[PDB]
UniProtKB/Swiss-Prot annotation:
Modification after translation (UniProt): Acetylation impairs ability to promote interaction between Akt/AKT1 and PHLPP1. Deacetylation by SIRT7 promotes interaction between Akt/AKT1 and PHLPP1, leading to suppress Akt/AKT1 activation. Ubiquitinated, leading to degradation in a proteasome-dependent manner. Deubiquitinated by USP49, leading to stabilization.
Name the UniProt record assigns to this protein: Peptidyl-prolyl cis-trans isomerase FKBP5
Outcome following mutation: K16Q: Mimics acetylation; impaired interaction with AKT1 and PHLPP1
Top-rank taxon, per record: Eukaryota
Organism of origin: Homo sapiens (Human)
Residues of the full protein shown: 16 to 140 of 457
Phylogenetic placement of the source organism: Eukaryota, Metazoa, Chordata, Craniata, Vertebrata
UniProt subcellular location: Cytoplasm; Nucleus
Residues with PTM N6-acetyllysine: K16
Length: 128
């Protein structure tokens, strides 16, 4: 399914090229610009564990999740991944623990040393 397709065909968007964040675009955005570090970004997401089980979604609060890009307000994989997205884009990200919650996890929802899958939609971005 989708996570195995990211494993097998995803683009490595990390600077080190350690496969820490792999990406597949699912829906093109509009406009060619991506957010700059420091921009406010507005996302919907669905997050699944390696066995396919949901661990979280913005839709659980029925509102977009809002954060400042590149400030470490989110896991590393999001600061990297969202920066690559255009407004309106939907992508799939597979995120190794080093770029997510590491050996600590976020228990019980996220186990130790968990590779995470996200489907993320970049709804909007705005400058600071």
């Amino acid at each position: 399914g989708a996570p195995a397709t990211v494993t097998e065909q995803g683009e490595d968007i990390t600077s080190k090229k350690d496969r820490g964040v792999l990406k597949i675009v699912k829906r093109v955005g509009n406009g060619e610009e991506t957010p700059m570090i420091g921009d406010k970004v507005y996302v919907h997401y669905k997050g699944k564990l390696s066995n396919g089980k949901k661990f979280d979604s913005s839709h659980d609060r029925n509102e977009p999740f809002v954060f400042s890009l590149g400030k470490g307000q989110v896991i590393k994989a999001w600061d990297i991944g969202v920066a690559t997205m255009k407004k309106g884009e939907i992508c799939h990200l597979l995120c190794k623990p080093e770029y997510a919650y590491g050996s600590a996890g976020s228990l019980p929802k996220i186990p130790s040393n968990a590779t995470l899958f996200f489907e993320i939609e970049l709804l909007d971005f705005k400058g600071e």
